[PDB]
Design a protein around this ligand. Structure first.
Ligand SMILES: CCCCC/C=C\C/C=C\CCCCCCCC(=O)O[C@H](COC(=O)CCCCCCCCCCCCCCC)COP(=O)([O-])OCC[N+](C)(C)C
Ligand SMILES: CCCCC/C=C\C/C=C\CCCCCCCC(=O)O[C@H](COC(=O)CCCCCCCCCCCCCCC)COP(=O)([O-])OCC[N+](C)(C)C
Ligand SMILES: CCCCC/C=C\C/C=C\CCCCCCCC(=O)O[C@H](COC(=O)CCCCCCCCCCCCCCC)COP(=O)([O-])OCC[N+](C)(C)C
Ligand SMILES: CC(C)CCC[C@@H](C)[C@H]1CC[C@H]2[C@@H]3CC=C4C[C@@H](O)CC[C@]4(C)[C@H]3CC[C@]12C
Lengths: 382, 378
């Protein structure tokens, strides 16, 4: 309805402005305040999670409006569905909790409750919300999500469907959340040197960064084993292995910068070349293999596929441009997040880029679901 | 029905505008050029656009065929949703400019560039050559403005008279523009323009009423109907007398001619005369109320299209109050009667005058639909 469209637009505008203001305040705090780095890192995971949930609600609304059969693609129950308004409500409720926790931590209203326990309690309450035997909240969707997450984490044990690969890609985008969680664990273990967690890179950080790409690589290998087709799966596996190569080269470069062994330059060059390789690989896969654009058969649409479900091709063109820019940004953000690299500007770069990466993956979800509905690019469906 | 994309844009713009207003309030409480004077014109324009969208929605709901009265094309019409969208976008730009002024994010860019750029967009929006951003309606508005400004040369239609009345209620924007010109010329004695008033200020204040007076004279010449057009001419000359007498009184206050009291009394009497004239003409004729025919309705015209008569009573009371309010507002704005608090009173009253003119638009269009009050139709 028209009123529903107005409500969705109002929510989108309010959320966009609030997110932009929060990011601007975060960057302003950085390089001007000290000891705000751990707080920003702690709250960035929740901020990104809320942003991803709201943008997924927007994706569901757009798929419903354009006629994209995302329900069939995800193989969800036609009778019972989670409307875009439900996702918006979930995102707003989580955002309200996050804002309240941040405000309480900053104000320190009560000395009895320590300031540092507020984010921990918020993240524990969020986990309990995710895993709740009671039917207090939506139980069908939550149980489906829990089962899908368990399947995704067990990439080689279970066969790969569209939903599993899609959530693996989302986690690949949301790797910043996992990295921030690991950093907060380190901060609680050691801080609670002062910056020892972020001052020096370590293998556990690289493994945490590579985890999402690790699951994606295992899923692609399992798909190759099942279907025995090298082109659609081993190429993607190599695309994801570029992430591991770049992360390990960055870690070696940072370590040899800390300790001079004359191998810093070669590690730097290896990191640069593999970063370019990974950026190009991911960009090419997203633009062509996932979206399906640049199709030769397209005669009416230039640089796009023959069939398009969205009214405007300007959407596709701006999506291509923003995907290029934000893929480069996401690769460099992963580089700085996994390994120390820039000491000061790294945190600001990560804070600026993570919301941009989430938005890029939101657009990617849009176009990938459109292509999947139009053609069985993923081949998951019959 | 309006496009769903238009509704989405309206909602997004409204949300961004609300959040920007909250941020502006927080910055103002938490934190060279008078910003209120510069930004009052833009705020009034945005408020007028929003109220015009409300007016269009109400006209559509009540059955008022405003398109025929305005001689607009039935095939293409600017729905209230488009008016809300443009109002929200302009408000977002205005709030962004004000926030930039408050924060001064960029040092190299002078602060004063922010407002000039803002208004620079708006005029560029109004004169955009490309066929975009409601280009047809924009061109119609440009033609209507040109015809209104050339009051005597062109015959007066309902649209021209309506836009002239709008300018009469929107004289605050012109006054602020003139004040900005004076500030640029002289300031860049402190507050020389604020301290003293001159005849040019009175002429600028009277430009809208001057245009209305010329339009009424042209209508008298064309139709040959002496009564209504000449009464309208007297009603628009009362304001000229008010402003000139106020300016003379202010000058006598500045320079001790010793005849200040006589001019003050003349200003007061002409002010009450102008207020009574405008009130009587608006309620008796423009709205068509107080008709003798109405038997079941008291102080109201026989035929009413709005759901409730309480609307008609509240409109009567608010018009009674706000016509006098707008008279005093002109008095202070055009002359240095209350230099210490004149600006505050003027800026408080300007939104009130805009709201009064919005209700007046509602009821004038209802009356025009019911009867050919303006005589613009055969
Ligand atoms: C690194 C930290 C974690 C990173 C983030 C992890 C996961 C989030 C990613 C995706 C969420 C699922 C999006 C739906 C996509 C399919 C399209 C669709 O909208 O389909 C929906 C599926 O609804 C969902 O799945 C739920 C949407 C997500 C809600 C979030 C739950 C609360 C989370 C709390 C936070 C926990 C983390 C702790 C804090 C660190 C259809 O709804 P239905 O009710 O028909 O469901 C099917 C039910 N049958 C099959 C029985 C009928
Ligand atoms: C960075 C620039 C690149 C962005 C790329 C964007 C791609 C989105 C593509 C398609 C959207 C599907 C449109 C459905 C309507 C088509 C059928 C039709 O005719 O419905 C219309 C009504 O439709 C609508 O009211 C559309 C409302 C749907 C929600 C909008 C989703 C698109 C993104 C904008 C909101 C997010 C703002 C930025 C977030 C930070 C009738
Ligand atoms: C200091 C001076 C400030 C500027 C002057 C004051 C106000 C400007 C705005 C509105 C006044 C006109 C309202 C007419 C209402 C009639 C009923 C109706 O709503 O019907 C509309 C009237 O459409 C309009 O005129 C447009 C309404 C206003 C929309 C905004 C336009 C941009 C304004 C920019 C302001 C910035 C100025 C910079 C500072 C100088 C019919 O729409 P259509 O699309 O059929 O248009 C007719 C097109 N045919 C003839 C081909 C079918
Ligand atoms: C200031 C005090 C004394 C009175 C103020 C009364 C104002 C608020 C009254 C005067 C006339 C009224 C309008 C008259 C007609 C309509 C059309 C209807 O379809 C929706 C409500 C609407 C738009 C009314 C809203 C309220 C309104 C604007």
């Amino acid at each position: 309805p028209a009123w529903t469209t107005f409500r969705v637009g109002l929510f989108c505008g309010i959320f966009i402005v609030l997110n932009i203001t929060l990011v601007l305040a975060a960057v302003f705090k950085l390089e001007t305040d000290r000891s705000i780095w751990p707080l920003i890192r702690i709250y960035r995971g929740g901020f990104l999670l809320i942003e991803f949930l709201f943008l997924l609600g927007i994706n569901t609304y757009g798929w419903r409006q354009a006629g994209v059969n995302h329900v069939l693609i995800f193989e969800l129950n036609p009778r019972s569905n989670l409307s875009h308004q439900h996702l918006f409500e979930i995102a707003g409720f989580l955002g309200i909790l996050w804002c309240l926790s941040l405000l309480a931590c900053f104000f320190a209203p009560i000395s009895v409750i320590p300031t540092y326990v507020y984010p921990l309690a918020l993240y524990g309450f969020m986990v309990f919300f995710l895993i709740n035997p009671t039917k207090t909240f939506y139980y069908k969707s939550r149980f489906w999500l829990l089962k899908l997450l368990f399947r995704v984490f067990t990439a080689p044990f279970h066969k790969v469907g569209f939903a599993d690969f899609w959530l693996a890609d989302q986690l690949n985008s949301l790797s910043v959340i996992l990295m921030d969680l690991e950093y907060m664990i380190c901060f609680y273990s050691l801080e609670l040197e002062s910056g020892i967690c972020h001052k020096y890179t370590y293998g556990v950080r690289a493994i945490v960064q590579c985890i999402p790409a690790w699951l994606r690589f295992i899923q692609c290998l399992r798909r190759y084993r099942d279907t025995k087709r090298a082109f659609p799966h081993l190429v993607n596996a190599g695309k994801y292995s570029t992430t591991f190569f770049m992360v390990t080269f960055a870690a070696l470069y940072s370590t040899h910068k800390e300790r001079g062994h004359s191998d810093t330059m070669v590690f730097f060059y290896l990191w640069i070349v593999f970063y370019i390789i990974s950026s190009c690989y991911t960009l090419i896969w997203d633009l062509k293999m996932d979206w399906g654009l640049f199709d030769k058969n397209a005669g009416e649409n230039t640089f796009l596929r023959e069939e398009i479900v969205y009214p405007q091709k300007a959407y596709y063109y701006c999506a291509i441009i923003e995907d290029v820019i934000l893929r480069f940004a996401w690769t460099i953000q992963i580089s700085i997040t996994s390994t120390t690299l820039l000491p000061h500007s790294g945190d600001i770069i990560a804070t600026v880029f993570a919301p941009l990466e989430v938005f890029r993956r939101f657009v990617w979800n849009f176009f990938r679901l459109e292509n999947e509905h139009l053609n069985n690019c993923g081949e998951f469906r019959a």
